[PDB]
Structure 1
Amino acid sequence: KVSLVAPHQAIFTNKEVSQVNLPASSGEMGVLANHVPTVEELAPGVVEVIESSGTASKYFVSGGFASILPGSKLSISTVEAHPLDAFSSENIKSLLAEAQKNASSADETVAAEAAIEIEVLEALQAAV
């Protein structure tokens, strides 16, 4: 029973799942059957949902808030949720190289925005 609904499409929608492992703010938590209530913030990691057997679908979430209801319901509300096969290795190196050179090079919010983009690009490139 998962409710992974994005702001453009629905992934889980209906309750027809078993286990789901999503990266939260603390550690890589994983929901099982009757999960406990835990409303922690989701970080920019991989949100894999195991479908009974080995039919897991790795969905690289951009970060959100993993809400766990008391009736064994998991609501993973994220902004963007794409698979691992929808990313390119050549295009990912261009975004990480431009964010590293722009960091600590100006003022205002230009140097602060480059530090968050370099950390999210390094975690997605290491999980190929």
Structure 2
Amino acid sequence: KVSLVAPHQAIFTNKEVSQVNLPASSGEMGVLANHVPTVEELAPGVVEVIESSGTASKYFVSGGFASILPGSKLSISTVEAHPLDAFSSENIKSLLAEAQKNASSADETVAAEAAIEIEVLEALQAAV
């Protein structure tokens, strides 16, 4: 029973799931059957929802809020949800190199935005 709905399309929609190893704000947690109501935020990681057997879909979520209701309902509301095969390895290396050179080189919000983008690009490249 998962309700992973994004702001453009619905993935889980209906309650037809079991396990959901989605990355929250703390660590790489995983929702089981009737988990506790933990409405914590989600970070940019890998939201692999194990459907019964080994039919897990590696959905590379960019962050959001994993709301857990008291009636065994996991509403993982994120911004984006793309698969692991939808990211080319050639274009992923160009974005990480441009963010590292722009970091600690200017002022205002240029150095702050480049530091957060380098951490999300390094975690997605190691899970390919």
Same fold (TM over 0.5): yes
Question: In structure 2, how many angstroms separate the alpha carbons of the residues matched to 1:52 and 1:22?
Answer: 15
Cα displacement (A) at 1:25: 1.1
Cα displacement (A) at 1:116: 0.5
Structure with more strand by fraction:
1
Provide the aligned C-alpha RMSD in A: 0.5
Cα displacement (A) at 1:81: 0.4
- What SS does the corresponding residue of 1:28 show, helix, strand or coil? coil
Calculate the TM-score normalised by the size of structure 1: 0.99
Q: Deviations over 1:57-85 (max 9, x none)?
A: 11000000000000000000000000001
Calculate the TM-score normalised by the size of structure 2: 0.99
Unpaired segments of 5 or more residues in structure 1? Answer: none
Overall identity of the aligned pairs, in %: 100
Q: Deviations over 1:8-45 (max 9, x none)?
A: 00000000001000111111110011111001111100
Cα displacement (A) at 1:110: 0.5
- What SS does the corresponding residue of 1:8 show, helix, strand or coil? coil
